[PDB]
Design a binder for this molecule. Structure first.
Ligand SMILES: [K+]
Ligand SMILES: [K+]
Lengths: 382, 382
């Protein structure tokens, strides 16, 4: 059976983007599965396919294979191999073992929390391969949980559920991250609270020291935990009471009483703090995605610029600004243009300490822009 | 005596850019020197000034000071302090001690080569302060050389010369960089051959392993030296026979017998190697700046694309591409859009391994764009 795409889809696969949408599929199989994709009689790639979804084609190979399933599982082995080294070296750490498209494993994500892996499948073809996935993980873990309750599964016509796949899945797990530890919650109705894409950026914070630090959009307090090691006072701000509860629990776990949580609207607080003359030696801005769609950019840009402008005005000379965006539509060029505008408007000279982004376990593909969503930059006020 | 700027010049300084051109200077001193800059009666900054040049104002402080000379030398002390830790642990290394505007020391650059400093000044005010610069460096070095032959000095009406300022300056010195050593020529007529802005990027390459590596635009062969310890064969390519002579010399100094130099035109060679069916496990592209002015960008972009497209085609699956640009006007956004275009045209999927640039000793200011000129990225063919 073959999937036939139009010229538009052909140009996309030739450029090595991994997605072809339904409107560009001329014909294809009646059921979802793994099939070769063609432009006329020309082979283009092997892909996960679903005839009932908007994102119909997700490529994983750009060369033919006698056994599509074997090929896909080869990609799985290759992804795990890239993390082998770090798992033997840092067994109690938190790492992503499989990052979907980035690892040429569209529709599959696997996270590792101190020996306990959590699998999330969002493409129909993976469902029947979950047992093989669990066995591939076995050599590296104590247990495997199938957390398959993401709403995206509804699009693929998949059932929603959360069930163990291998071993005994614990309710909570302590993860070591540099000089601190945090508690992950593997239960369905509870916040996992790991946010691994920021693992390296959080560790990077350990090199800074000072009197007062402000962690805006603190969510589970990860950045705050690391800042507490070098700062006298760390204020963790977030509008989620539940998130701040986790933050307080993680601080307690580390015996870090110098972290105080504040339930408030980030935007209002920043302006208010500046109004009453409060100053900080470091501010971390890790807001949720301000721009969902490509049409939200203009408005998002203004929102980012405002929060960054207010953060910079709170900094003393020598102050540190750690700012990020996890909106893939807020492109890296737009992001840095925005911080430059905020700095210019605040009349503060900023030196670039470091331009970062996603860690090695959250791979980015140059040819597939959507894989690059996180930007993280650190600056110092001169 | 003060420098008076118009509204436009004032807005530039308030946004914290460090330059104000002659067109925006309303009035100023009759001779070059260090003077405060004002917009009306409002103090804006302290700056190096020259009433005879297009780039009239170069700011170094945005706060007043009784003694402008003392303030400037204070900036010098602070720049050196930022390198004290690395000089203490790695005395035989090569580091930039002063990076002009980036260190708020406009018109001054100072490099350190295993205990021997080389000073290059391009602004009039620095000429009279050379002895004080030498004294500030005394605690950190064995000798200090004034390499003041850059033609840009003619714009400031300064003499061109090369002379020692402190100690006994050797003709050449060996510098240790990771697992390799290279020879620096301090003589006025020879190529220095250090290229310190690429130091950390060269070191980053020591982690890769493979059979054959290709170092294009090799210059003194720095990248090839680091690759030699990880690859069976390394081919260094450059159009300059003199440059390759230094390359062989460096290879010999390290006892590296797996590095072969090849005098050829990069563009021509890459195509021929492609047609010849040649393939490599790693290719490094470190071309000279293809763009110097903003008008050279359109054709420069095309040149970068061709060499990157050819390099990508030479890589085997799993191959590593380390590519760079030192053209300031070939902005980061244009650089990455260019590599993406090359990959798309080559029908090759690239994973982003790392996005780097200038190391800590070559500081970048967000508000002063011209300080950022180097882009270095590493990708892997999937
Ligand atoms: K959970
Ligand atoms: K020289």
């Amino acid at each position: 059976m073959r999937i036939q795409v139009n010229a538009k889809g052909a140009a996309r696969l030739l450029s090595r983007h991994l997605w072809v949408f339904r409107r560009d599929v001329v014909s294809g199989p009646e059921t979802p599965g793994l099939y070769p994709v063609y432009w006329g009689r020309r082979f283009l790639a092997l892909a996960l396919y679903n005839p009932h979804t908007d994102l119909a084609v997700r490529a994983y190979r750009f060369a033919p294979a006698e056994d599509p399933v074997a090929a896909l599982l080869e990609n799985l082995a290759q992804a795990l191999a890239r993390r082998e080294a770090v798992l033997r070296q840092d067994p109690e750490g938190g790492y992503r073992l499989v990052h979907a498209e980035g690892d040429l494993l569209p529709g599959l994500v696997v996270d590792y929390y101190a020996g306990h892996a959590v699998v999330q499948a969002t493409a129909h073809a993976w469902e029947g391969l979950l047992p093989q996935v669990a066995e591939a993980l076995r050599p590296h873990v104590q247990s495997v949980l199938a957390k398959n309750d993401a709403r995206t599964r509804e699009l693929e016509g998949l059932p929603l559920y959360v069930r163990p796949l291998l071993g005994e899945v614990p309710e909570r797990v302590q993860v070591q991250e540099g000089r601190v530890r945090y508690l992950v919650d593997l239960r369905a109705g509870q916040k996992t609270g790991a946010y691994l894409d920021q693992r390296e950026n959080r560790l990077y914070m350990e090199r800074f020291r000072g009197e007062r630090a402000l962690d805006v959009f603190s969510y589970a307090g990860g950045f705050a935990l690391h800042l507490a090691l070098g700062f006298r006072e760390v204020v963790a701000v977030d509008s989620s009471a539940e998130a701040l509860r986790r933050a307080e629990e993680n601080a307690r776990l580390n015996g870090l009483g110098n972290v105080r949580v504040l339930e408030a609207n980030a935007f209002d607080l920043l302006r208010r703090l500046e109004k009453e003359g409060e100053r900080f030696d470091l501010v971390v801005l890790d807001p949720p995605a301000f721009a969902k769609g490509k049409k939200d950019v203009e408005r998002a840009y203004r929102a980012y610029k405002e929060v960054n402008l207010r953060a910079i005005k709170l900094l003393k000379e020598g102050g540190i600004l750690a700012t990020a965006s996890c909106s893939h539509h807020m492109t890296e060029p737009l992001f840095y243009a925005m911080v430059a505008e905020a700095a210019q408007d605040a009349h503060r000279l900023l030196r670039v300490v470091e331009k970062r982004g996603q860690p090695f376990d959250h791979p980015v593909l140059l040819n597939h822009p959507e894989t690059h969503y996180l930007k993280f930059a650190v600056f110092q006020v001169l």
